[PDB]
Symmetry: D2
Subunit: 255 residues, 4 copies
Amino acid sequence: GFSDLRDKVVIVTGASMGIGRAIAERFVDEGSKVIDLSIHDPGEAKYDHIECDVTNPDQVKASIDHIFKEYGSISVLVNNAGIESYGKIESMSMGEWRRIIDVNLFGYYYASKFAIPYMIRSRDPSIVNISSVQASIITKNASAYVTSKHAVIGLTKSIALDYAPLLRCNAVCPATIDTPLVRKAAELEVGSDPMRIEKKISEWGHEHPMQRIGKPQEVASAVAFLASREASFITGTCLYVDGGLSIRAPISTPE
Amino acid sequence: GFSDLRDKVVIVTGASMGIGRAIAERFVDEGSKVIDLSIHDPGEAKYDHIECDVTNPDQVKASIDHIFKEYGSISVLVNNAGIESYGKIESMSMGEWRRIIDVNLFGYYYASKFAIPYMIRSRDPSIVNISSVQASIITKNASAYVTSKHAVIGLTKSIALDYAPLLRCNAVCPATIDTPLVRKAAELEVGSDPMRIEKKISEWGHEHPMQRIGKPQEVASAVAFLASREASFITGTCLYVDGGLSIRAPISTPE
Amino acid sequence: GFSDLRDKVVIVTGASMGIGRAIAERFVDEGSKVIDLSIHDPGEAKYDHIECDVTNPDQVKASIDHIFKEYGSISVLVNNAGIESYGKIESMSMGEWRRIIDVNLFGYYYASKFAIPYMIRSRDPSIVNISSVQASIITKNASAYVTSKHAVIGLTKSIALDYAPLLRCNAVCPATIDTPLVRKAAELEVGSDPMRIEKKISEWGHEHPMQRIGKPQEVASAVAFLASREASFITGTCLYVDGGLSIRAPISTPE
Amino acid sequence: GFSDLRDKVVIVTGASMGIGRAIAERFVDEGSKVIDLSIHDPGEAKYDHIECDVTNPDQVKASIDHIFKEYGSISVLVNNAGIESYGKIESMSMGEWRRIIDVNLFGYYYASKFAIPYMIRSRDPSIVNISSVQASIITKNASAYVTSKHAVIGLTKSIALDYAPLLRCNAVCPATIDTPLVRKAAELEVGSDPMRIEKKISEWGHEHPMQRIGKPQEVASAVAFLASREASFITGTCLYVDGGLSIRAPISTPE
Ligand SMILES: NC(=O)C1=CN([C@@H]2O[C@H](COP(=O)(O)OP(=O)(O)OC[C@H]3O[C@@H](n4cnc5c(N)ncnc54)[C@H](O)[C@@H]3O)[C@@H](O)[C@H]2O)C=CC1
Ligand SMILES: NC(=O)C1=CN([C@@H]2O[C@H](COP(=O)(O)OP(=O)(O)OC[C@H]3O[C@@H](n4cnc5c(N)ncnc54)[C@H](O)[C@@H]3O)[C@@H](O)[C@H]2O)C=CC1
Ligand SMILES: NC(=O)C1=CN([C@@H]2O[C@H](COP(=O)(O)OP(=O)(O)OC[C@H]3O[C@@H](n4cnc5c(N)ncnc54)[C@H](O)[C@@H]3O)[C@@H](O)[C@H]2O)C=CC1
Ligand SMILES: NC(=O)C1=CN([C@@H]2O[C@H](COP(=O)(O)OP(=O)(O)OC[C@H]3O[C@@H](n4cnc5c(N)ncnc54)[C@H](O)[C@@H]3O)[C@@H](O)[C@H]2O)C=CC1
């Protein structure tokens, strides 16, 4: 593991399930003091939790102010909370489109804006933003989602350039990962039959060169690496955790 | 010139000055029927002008309705209206940060959303979005602006993927171009002194491999190309009009 | 068309068939004085032809020296000659692997190296290199080919940075285009049955958002644009002519 | 540390100094069995050394055979050996240009080609190729070098796609790192004066957002991560260790 993470204060948004829960648990295993900021109670967890809607800047600010007072510092912020709904620009309501940008982009902007002043008071603070492989290669009927994930890359670069060398900021770009969001996406296409759901997920996995979809813990490893001093000269980039998806052209060749 | 642009209905947002004006003027020269949607009156102009705030959907929708009813079709939409103000994520007010996103991203979203249903009924529909070289290499203290330009790329790819093959959507990514926005940028940095602003602009030009900043007409050429049938198999991409800026590392080598 | 190309001397390598022939014909239509450098006689063509193997630097140099003496100048060089053979790094002989790099990369290096001294003696000379969508998203069993196309992008950037602002150098990155090379690739997979060949090509076309493969003339339009003064502030970039292929993730979403 | 690297057989080319040496040393610290394949003797070293010219396939193949027979497996191959000399495409001799391609690209090709059959029989095989930040943003008068680094990216993606899921292949893209190669670069530019070389290096460091050049150990950290099981769903990508250099536009903004 990354020894330097032990005892450091780490805030992870949307860590009550999926990738965020995996990230929180990894930091706990690294010995960090972890706090989840989300709108769902993970229940019995080894990490702290504060009810917090990332689209509410006042609640985000209050939650972060509280964490700094309670723990004494903030060394790492992992922006992960995100949602996805589907629809063509002509079918999705303007309200839903905006809501996706609000959670996926503005949530990252608010958490970063309020954590940074505190983070720079710590040694070598680091922010890791979860974007998507869709910051490069995209899916259909995902206008708002795709737009928000591209936006996250811009925010990441900006924070990195604006606060270097004191604080680093990077993003992780995962392809399909086994999480509630993805299980839900499969159900929305094939139903609740666990047999048909596995077939759908297997199909997606076969589209990735690695021949399977990723596991939450695999994204967590990338986040821990970027948050650690092992990535001391890495800032402003996106580390793709995509099983090779973003480099594959879907054009057959003779075998 | 591109003979297919003749008589085509072309909408350009933010065409009362700078790059937008040069784009409208180029399409007028190509024989197109051009309409500017902007908050400022360009005054004496070879193209039509409609007072329109791109952040007001009611106004955007009505302007587009007026254009379709009056002209009978809409073949090209160039989203160009944009603004920029500076500040680190810590200094800029949340209101100003949101405003930049509203004009630069939501303005493109509203115009695209309301124009698309009309465009898909028209001939060779094409949307060109003006992003920035900053969708790749970025500047300091420009968090909102940079985020918005990356967001535009995502919006561009999604429209391209969701409406191909009938409609194409591409972006143009300009580096430093001689416009009022750039003149303002220099002034905000070196003051109102005309000869000093001149020096600042020259400096920026020398940072570009082409050894000068770009001209609005050079961006217009790229836009006209992408809007034309000449770009019939080009969709979802950003054409960089940056004088080589995005491929230059600021590291000297032996001469 | 691009009026500025009329009467200018344009050299196109590998213009005896496919994309190269399409490029040569487009420049002829633009009024340019075109010369093909290839190892195949296009037969009755409106452009000049000189037997020339691009892997032979002496023959390349002699052919270019001859063109400058005969025509008086060289304004545009289009590096297009290229080959593709398939094989895993473990199956393809080292000789064949090297041969692909020799034609695809060294051919571009030689033609550029010998044409440049002459080109800088003309006004606003331009080099256009044909790379591939595979400079970004790649196919299986195409090690040497993929490597060579990535290499072409590096050479393109280098030439652009080294000779700006006098001479510009850009690349075109096509996805699947209807040419002998592609028809051959299909046959290597399904045989000579025109019915089965069309089905294979149709399959590839459906993988592109545009729902069809591209036409040689579509790549030619991009080359003409980059070679012209319409692209005066464009250098060091690759213009993707891919029907949206490079921005598509092969992961289904609910519809 | 990464516990899975213990006892794994790791081959590092060009590990007698600079980045290569730091990489070998890091793997030795992780408990791996490390062998350096390079033309120069590192002398007193914690890892094994074998005199090997990466451009000589007979020698590369024999060295890899000796390693597999002696150690019983090969789990990681780090291609790092590389050279750089300067000159515009017009001044550098063709022989020197070809040599840079031979060492920087063919060396990676030979080592990968001969190691792969052994690696696929081993545990968690992973290949890490050292490219450069110049696979994106480039320097002047470095045609061969830049071309070779872009080529390495293509080679990386193809090995990744052709051998997934059993073997992973990624690249690391460093910006300026304190090594003899960089010391030589400065000397060739500002002379042998030690304090002037110091000034030149400082200047380059200040061009990086992190405000300093990188350390060889920082590149080694990225390599160890990508070679480890922690990067189990990461393949075909380049991890940029550039202190933010590739995302920085050299254009000033108001402060
Ligand atoms: N699952 C996948 O394949 C991929 C996921 N991602 C990204 O990874 C992140 C996590 O995704 P998943 O674990 O899959 O989804 P998930 O739905 O399982 O987890 C989302 C978490 O976000 C929290 N959340 C949602 N809206 C919130 C709000 N307004 N305020 C506070 N918390 C809120 C939820 O409480 C939950 O804990 C997201 O940013 C997602 O876009 C990126 C690429 C792929
Ligand atoms: N000037 C440069 O170097 C670059 C400009 N760009 C982009 O090109 C576009 C044009 O930029 P410039 O001509 O330089 O700037 P500019 O300030 O000279 O022109 C902006 C135009 O936007 C219109 N506009 C602003 N807010 C509006 C609103 N709410 N509703 C309707 N119209 C509105 C204005 O009326 C004006 O005509 C922008 O999207 C900008 O981000 C991208 C890269 C470089
Ligand atoms: N067809 C496609 O889908 C794509 C083609 N490209 C590139 O476009 C270029 C043209 O491709 P195509 O027209 O499809 O292939 P093609 O095989 O039809 O045409 C190749 C041309 O190269 C010439 N040539 C080959 N080896 C030569 C040598 N040693 N010296 C001189 N001339 C030589 C041939 O005489 C021929 O005229 C190549 O660089 C190819 O890699 C890139 C992406 C896609
Ligand atoms: N130093 C820097 O800032 C950067 C270095 N890189 C890359 O990192 C790698 C290491 O670079 P450095 O340590 O800086 O340079 P270096 O010159 O200090 O080390 C090069 C190593 O390559 C070995 N080598 C050279 N030719 C060889 C051959 N024919 N056969 C076997 N071994 C050979 C040498 O013995 C030496 O140990 C290279 O691939 C370089 O292109 C990439 C970006 C930046």
